[PDB]
């Protein structure tokens, strides 16, 4: 994978434990761009975030993270 499989990214970050998925939600909100479609519902405690609109910089940083966190 030279590029990021957006499917393995999505399904890879939501399968994680607290420390891992929290690290995910913090990276996406820290560098929140006008493209990425985030919706933090604090009631259910969830980040409904569209990774498809993440820049290459973010979806690579997140991929590297969640892939070494799962594999």
């Amino acid at each position: 994978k030279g590029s990021v499989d957006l499917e393995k990214l999505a399904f890879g970050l939501t399968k994680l434990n607290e420390d891992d998925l929290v690290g995910v939600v913090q990276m996406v909100t820290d560098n929140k761009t006008p493209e990425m479609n985030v919706t933090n519902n604090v009631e259910e405690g969830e980040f409904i975030i569209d990774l498809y609109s993440l820049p290459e910089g973010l979806l690579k940083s997140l991929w590297d993270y969640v892939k070494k966190n799962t594999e």
């Binding site: 957006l6 969830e46 409904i48 569209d50 498809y52």
Partner: protein, 58 residues
């Protein structure tokens, strides 16, 4: 030498492929059944987005 009147532009066309985007709902670990830790309590009912109906238009 002279380069001359070379290189014509190419007139292309659009392609509307927006596609259903792959969104994900990352579930954060809120106050559930877990080990000995105290959670949170609501401050008050603020009603910050309180709507209003009309003022002067008879």
């Amino acid at each position: 030498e002279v380069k001359s009147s070379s290189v014509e532009i190419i007139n292309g066309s659009e392609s509307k492929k927006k596609k259903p985007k792959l969104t994900v709902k990352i579930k954060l670990n809120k106050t559930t059944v877990l080990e000995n830790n105290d959670g949170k309590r609501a401050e008050e009912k603020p009603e910050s987005k309180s709507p209003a109906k009309k003022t002067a238009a008879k």
